Symmetry: C5
Subunit: 95 residues, 5 copies
C-alpha cells in the first residue's frame, strides 16, 4: 500500500489531478444540462441544414446537411457552463 | 533514449501530464459507472421528455424529445465523482 | 456547506480546475462551430476516400473508405479554436 | 511569427499544454486498450442488468438494460491506466 | 463588459486555460488524421473482433468480438501526437 498512497499527498499532484476531475465533472452537470434540456428547445428550431450535395466517388450521392443550430447549442454549452460556474466563484470566493 | 528519457524527468511535464492522466482515468471509471448503473435507473424513470415539434426544412417531421432525465444523470455525474474522490483522495489527505 | 464550499478556494484548485472548465467549455463553442458549419461544407468536398478492400474475421468484406477531408475538417477544427481563443482572450491579454 | 513563437517560451504554457497533450494522448493508448481488448471480454460476462421496467409517457415500453459490464470495464479503465504510467514514467523517475 | 475581459487576463488562466485549449485541439487534429487517413488502412487489417461467446441472460448471444487492432488504431495517435508535436512545437523550441 506504500507505493500508491504516500506518494499521493505531495506537491501539486493533488492540486491538479482532482482539478481535472473538477473540469470534466462540473462541465458535464452543465453541458449535459445544455444538450439534453435545451438543445431540444434548439432542435425545435430546425430552419437550418440547407441541403448540400456531396457526390463521394465511393457512392454517397443522395445529399448532406450543413446544419447550423447546434452551433447555437454550442454556445448553450459554453455560456451555461460559464453561468453555472460564474455564479459560484464570484459569490463566496471572488469577494 | 536520450531525447525522450532525459527530457522526461523535468519541471511540471510530469506533475501536470501524469495529473491529467489521473483526471481522465478516475473520471472514466466513475462517470462510466454513473451511466452504466444509475442513468438507466433514471432512464427507468422515463416519464420525462414531452415531445418537441421541430419541422426541419430538410424534411424530418415525426417528432423530437425535450429529453430531461440524462440531465438528472449528469447531476449523478457531477455528484458521485465528488464523493468517490472525497473519500479515497480527500479523507486521508485533508485529515 | 462548510467543509465543502470553504475548502473550495485555497491554492491552485480554483485557477486550474476551472481553466479546464474553460479548456472543455471554450473549445466546444468553437469546435462545434467547425463541425456543424464547416465540416458539412467539407462534406461537399467529398472527393477523398477511394475505396479500401479490407476483410475482417467477423466478415465485413464489401468495402472500406480511406477517408481524408475530415482530416481537412480536423485542421479547420484546430485553427479556428486558435483564432477564437486569440480574439476574446488573447487580444485583450497580449496588450 | 514573433507574437506566436516568443509568447510560447514564456511561463508554463510549454510545460502545461504539452502536458495535457501527454495526458489525453497517453490514456488514448491505454483506455482504448481497455475497451477494445478487454471490455468485450467484459461483455463476455454477459449476465448483467436484469431488465428495468421503465414506463415512459412518450413511447418506449419494452425493456431497459443497466449494464454492469461497462462499469466492470471502467474498473479496467482506471486500474490499467495506473500501470502504463507507473512503468514508463515512474520506474526511472521514482528511482 | 469590464469584469469579464479584464479579470480574464490575470494570473495563469490565459496561460492555463489556453494551454489546455492547446491540449484539446492539437491532439484532436493529429488523432483524426489518425482516424481518417489511417483507420481505413487499419480496418483493412482486420486484426479486431476475434469471435467470442458471452451469454447475456438479457438477450445478445449470437456472437461476440474482442477488438485487437483498435488497440492498433490507438497507438497511431499517441505516437503521432508525439510526432506531429515534435516538429512544429519542439524543434524550434528545444534549440
Amino acid at each position: 500500500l506504500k507505493g500508491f498512497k504516500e506518494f499521493l499527498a505531495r506537491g501539486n499532484i493533488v492540486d491538479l489531478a482532482v482539478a481535472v476531475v473538477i473540469g470534466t465533472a462540473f462541465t458535464a452537470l452543465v453541458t449535459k444540462f445544455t444538450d439534453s434540456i435545451i438543445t431540444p428547445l434548439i432542435n425545435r428550431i430546425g430552419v437550418n441544414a440547407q441541403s448540400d450535395v456531396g457526390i463521394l466517388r465511393i457512392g454517397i450521392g443522395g445529399g448532406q446537411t450543413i446544419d447550423l443550430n447546434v452551433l447555437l447549442s454550442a454556445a448553450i454549452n459554453f455560456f451555461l457552463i460559464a453561468f453555472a460556474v460564474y455564479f459560484l466563484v464570484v459569490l463566496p470566493y471572488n469577494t
